[PDB]
Subunit: 113 residues, 4 copies
Amino acid sequence: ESPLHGTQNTINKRTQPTFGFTVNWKFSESTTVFTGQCFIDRNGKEVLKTMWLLRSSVNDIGDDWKATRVGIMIFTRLCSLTGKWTNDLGSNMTIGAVNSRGEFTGTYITAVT
Amino acid sequence: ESPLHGTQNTINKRTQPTFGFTVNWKFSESTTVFTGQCFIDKEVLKTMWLLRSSVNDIGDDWKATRVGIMIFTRCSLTGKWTNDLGSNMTIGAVNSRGEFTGTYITAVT
Amino acid sequence: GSKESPLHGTQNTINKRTQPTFGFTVNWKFSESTTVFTGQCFIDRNGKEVLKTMWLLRSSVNDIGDDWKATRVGIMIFTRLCSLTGKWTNDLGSNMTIGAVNSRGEFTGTYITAVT
Amino acid sequence: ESPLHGTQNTINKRTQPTFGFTVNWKFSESTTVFTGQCFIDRNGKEVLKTMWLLRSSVNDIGDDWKATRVGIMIFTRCSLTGKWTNDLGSNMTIGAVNSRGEFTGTYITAVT
Ligand SMILES: O=C(O)CCCC[C@@H]1SC[C@@H]2NC(=O)N[C@@H]21
Ligand SMILES: O=C(O)CCCC[C@@H]1SC[C@@H]2NC(=O)N[C@@H]21
Ligand SMILES: O=C(O)CCCC[C@@H]1SC[C@@H]2NC(=O)N[C@@H]21
Ligand SMILES: O=C(O)CCCC[C@@H]1SC[C@@H]2NC(=O)N[C@@H]21
């Protein structure tokens, strides 16, 4: 498990907020950021559609150009962000309560490396 | 100003940590996340970002995310940073676990 | 439901054991935009050939000051409606036809997007 | 030195057109795609502002998630045709652009 920390937007309540979080990897020098929005899909299921940037560490500023990978992640419950979320890769995460400023913490387990 | 919340990687040394943060925009319903690395030789943050727009329908999700880069100049994340879009950021003390908060001002929309 | 647009690309391989990577550009005929797609063909759990791609959609901006916001990113998985040649479809409803691939790896085709 | 080709969009006859190209790397199995726009900058210089996706060949559909890198590339010496260079030390030359927006060129990468 690595800790995650982020926020969900609080501007309107007329939609399901966008959100972003950072996973602060505890087994490597990398960081990953996720950003997305929660939807009620056509079948009634909550879905988090996110995209992510995975930042690797480099030792030389001249290698900076190759340090960022990008991709998607769709999470389904195991539209409050709070709870447990799973993915098809087998990765999963837990999000705690969202407070009045829209902040939340959680934990992330990656099935893949 | 909009609040940012992130974490700096604390694994091993490292003189030049990676990091990530999320800016929760206070004038828009979107969210941006930045990730990158703090270099020192003079400190510079080289980041890439994803700007997530809010969409009304799950049908529109495909077009909701823009991407780009941002270099900030005046390795610790703590303190004041600027860039050449004219955007400014202030970052507070970093925790032993690596968590930080701050504020972000964007010069462009 | 859109106008068909041309696409042009190349595939790249050395070791026959892995399927080639490829990229292509779609030259949109109803907009000022350009999209590039890159990815690789796999055989699904299923059966099935799948093109797993990611894309960058470049909008036209008038002012270089607005360059920062001109690029969208996402994924697209295509399945036949592991050769690139033939007809491919996706979850949005978008459709793609790719012609024969030449000895240089070059290929062309047509793209119809069901979304804008 | 590696081959590229792509197309420029001329749907509005823009003096600052968008474009994209594929670079077919010759001594690897990777593919990079670039997309951007040609600008006349504030100081009169031509500048290509682009972003790229670099795709690695992976062995297994299960590693597909880690196969794509992203970043920017700004080229300076608005026509695409000619010689262009960047901060990394890389060099590109673009051929003639035909009536349909199509061009080919070569890309000498300085980094890997
Ligand atoms: O390898 C590292 O240094 C950290 C692990 C990165 C795991 C990535 S982050 C995006 C993708 N989605 C996942 O659930 N795991 C991978
Ligand atoms: O327009 C919005 O919805 C929020 C403002 C977005 C600001 C972006 S985030 C990436 C880029 N870097 C900046 O300093 N500002 C812009
Ligand atoms: O809107 C435009 O200017 C051109 C249409 C682009 C459609 C995009 S490209 C990425 C994604 N995949 C699709 O099949 N449609 C969208
Ligand atoms: O690594 C490979 O397998 C092929 C070389 C990749 C070169 C990349 S593409 C983006 C960036 N810009 C450059 O001029 N070189 C690198």
